[PDB]
């Protein structure tokens, strides 16, 4: 009556079916702000207090269509068999395969007819290097054994006497090698045939080009740069300590494990790419990268424009909860509200304590003037309770017990009958129920436990 709550509502709050709002703190829901004393479900509480998020499992063997940290709209397709149902930032969970592109910068030579090739200070991938009317035969200018290194397209020939390389030649697209790996070549014999036009491969790019004229041909000392991929398989008991597109040198750790063995250690300079996650976590949150020591920590709740990281050069745009990622090196703010919504007689006792009886008396007195019958009736009943508490001097929060009394032992006796057997009252079993559940609660609170 006092809190204007029906039997159903007061039941739901007291027996922890639904929450009740004490101080909304600017929280809103589905377009309308949170009003005080509004009953919200557990799902409404998790969506408000802790923000909304969802994890979508990915079918075996299939890779992801989207990337890490990519902003995702509702209805956007993340996987060939999975479609996201909400707006927010997408995150990888547990990558099955880690592909590392190792950086390689080498020098390699090539000889072509002067009339055929196009003079350029450098060369791009796909860019035509030469145009050959008649098929030309590239000839070995040194003696030794052939080491054939093949790319996705294009090749590398390393001729060597003993274990020392005597020469290194480059074979762009449109050039078919006429030798196998480990073949012995003399001076003059054809290594490859360049038929028609020839261009640079999609993967490798020529940084610098040094040309030298000799006879009717030209020799090109090329400074090349490319990346060679290497796949690493990750086990469920292993975790990746390296973010997307991160830079690592020799010795750096990529994937840790239970034992020192099977650990993935970066062999040389290269970039890291994650593929095939266990699932994808779509979170409604704001991404804030940091390049310096972060002041805020994970677990903290923050209002828009609060000091976050890098001495305060980055701040929050929205209301939410701070989740510090040290892997991707980014401070996340999960879109949520710091809202005070409770359950049980602790929340009820609070609402009863905050009640000013004089104000409600006046409000209901003004309400008693209304022409409607039901209005006057219910207001009379409510005012009867208010007048009762005011005249008596009792406080409404005494209807909720902080300290439950204990009836004297002789009025709930434990006695030994004639046969030496014991007989006791049911109140003792009831009190034991109370003390047990109370003490267990105090222990569960002390050690700390999930809210469930």
């Amino acid at each position: 009556t006092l809190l204007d709550l029906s039997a159903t509502e007061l039941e739901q709050v007291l027996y922890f079916s639904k929450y009740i709002v004490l101080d909304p703190k600017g929280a809103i829901l589905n377009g309308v702000p949170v009003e005080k004393r509004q009953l919200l479900t557990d799902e409404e509480y998790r969506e408000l207090r802790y923000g909304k998020q969802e994890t979508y499992p990915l079918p075996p063997g299939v890779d992801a269509l989207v990337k890490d940290g990519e902003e995702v709209v509702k209805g956007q397709e993340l996987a060939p068999g999975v479609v996201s149902r909400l707006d927010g930032v997408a995150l990888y969970r547990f990558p099955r395969r880690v592909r590392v592109e190792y950086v390689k910068k080498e020098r390699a030579g090539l000889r072509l007819p002067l009339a055929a090739w196009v003079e350029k200070e450098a060369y791009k991938p796909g860019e035509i290097l030469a145009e050959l009317p008649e098929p030309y035969l590239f000839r070995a200018e040194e003696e030794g054994v052939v080491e054939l290194k093949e790319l996705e397209e294009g090749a590398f020939l390393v001729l060597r006497r003993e274990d020392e390389p005597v020469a290194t030649y480059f074979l762009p697209v449109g050039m078919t090698p006429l030798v196998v790996h480990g073949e012995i070549v003399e001076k003059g014999q054809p290594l490859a045939e360049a038929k028609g036009l020839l261009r640079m491969p999609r993967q490798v790019r020529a940084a610098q080009v040094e040309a030298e004229e000799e006879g009717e041909t030209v020799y090109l000392t090329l400074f090349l740069e490319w990346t060679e991929p290497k796949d690493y398989r990750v086990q469920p008991h292993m975790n990746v300590v390296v973010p997307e597109g991160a830079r690592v040198e020799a010795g750096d750790k990529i994937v840790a494990a239970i034992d020192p063995e099977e650990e993935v250690i970066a062999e040389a300079e290269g970039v890291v790419h994650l593929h095939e996650p266990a699932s994808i976590l779509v979170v409604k949150a704001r991404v804030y990268p940091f390049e310096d020591d972060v002041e805020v920590s994970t677990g903290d709740r923050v209002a828009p424009g609060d000091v976050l990281a890098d001495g305060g050069k980055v701040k929050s745009d929205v209301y939410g909860r701070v989740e510090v990622d040290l892997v991707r090196n980014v401070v996340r703010v999960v879109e949520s509200y710091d809202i005070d919504a409770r359950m049980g007689a602790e929340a009820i006792q609070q609402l009863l304590k905050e009640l000013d009886l004089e104000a409600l008396e006046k409000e209901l007195l003004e309400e008693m003037k209304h022409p409607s019958r039901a209005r006057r009736a219910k207001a009379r009943k409510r005012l009867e309770v208010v007048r009762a508490f005011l005249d008596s001097g009792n406080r409404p929060e005494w209807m909720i017990l902080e300290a439950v009394p204990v009836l004297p032992p002789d009025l709930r006796p434990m006695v030994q009958v004639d046969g030496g057997r014991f007989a006791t009252s049911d109140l003792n079993d009831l009190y034991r129920r109370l003390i047990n559940r109370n003490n267990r609660l105090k222990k569960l609170l002390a050690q700390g436990a999930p809210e469930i």
């Binding site: 009958v417 009252s425 267990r440």
Partner: protein, 346 residues
Amino acid sequence: SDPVRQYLHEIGQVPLLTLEEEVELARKVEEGMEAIKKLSEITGLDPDLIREVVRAKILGSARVRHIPGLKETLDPKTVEEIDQKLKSLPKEHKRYLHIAREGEAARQHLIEANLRLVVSIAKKYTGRGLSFLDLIQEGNQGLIRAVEKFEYKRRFKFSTYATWWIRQAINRAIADQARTIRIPVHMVETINKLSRTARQLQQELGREPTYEEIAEAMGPGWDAKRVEETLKIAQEPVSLETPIGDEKDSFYGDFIPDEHLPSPVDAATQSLLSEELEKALSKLSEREAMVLKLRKGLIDGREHTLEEVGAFFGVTRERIRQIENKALRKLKYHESRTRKLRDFLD
């Protein structure tokens, strides 16, 4: 409406962990514990104090209370002084604070995830004196213990190590809370061992065993007398509200008299004894009666030695013992003649 069904619904919301997810959470927890250790090595503060501070910020301001194990009182002022003291550390050091936070958060998620296990276990322990929900919550305590004592390096599925601690907590609870007259756990194991013993014997002999027969099958140190004593101890009390008759108008405790409070006969007899004793002590002088009243404790309620009574009246202790002999002897002659105090001999 239904507390059991409601808790089962609150449990069905949290999805079950994948092997990767479970290992991840356990990993962050363990690394979190190491982070608290390292932060204690640096800060120079109590690991428990640090853990509770990290635990407070993770859980939020919704829970603020004093921890028994901690020396200082835990309040929002203190936890803010410490949190700011922790965030006053450099990059490589302050990292551990983030690790500790992430660890506690993973701990919350891990305990929240495996509550289904506790339910499917505690469901078997029903009917032993504790309610279903009581068993579940006690298994939840054991679940918490299992989480904090777990080591993910062993590649064991968490359910395997959790089950042991869960059963342990439940059994401890049943052993402690069941009996109205609380009995030590070891003694309960003894009594239950006596139960399985007597039931084994009754199953093989086709009848209920004697005290001596159980004494034999129990082994050394067990005779019929000790068995009977053990059974006497295991006897539980019965309710005073036990129904008497097929109507509801009668209770068991209605037929039990009060043995403590004095009947009017007792109080009247006691008063008559005090009066007759004073009538007897008035057949003496005031001095030789005062010696006795101080000797046996009628006055002041204390029995005095001969030295104190002699220190009061001013005579020697032998004079006091002489006076008390004369007084008692006079009371004997008074008794032999009057025949008054004889009936009070009981």
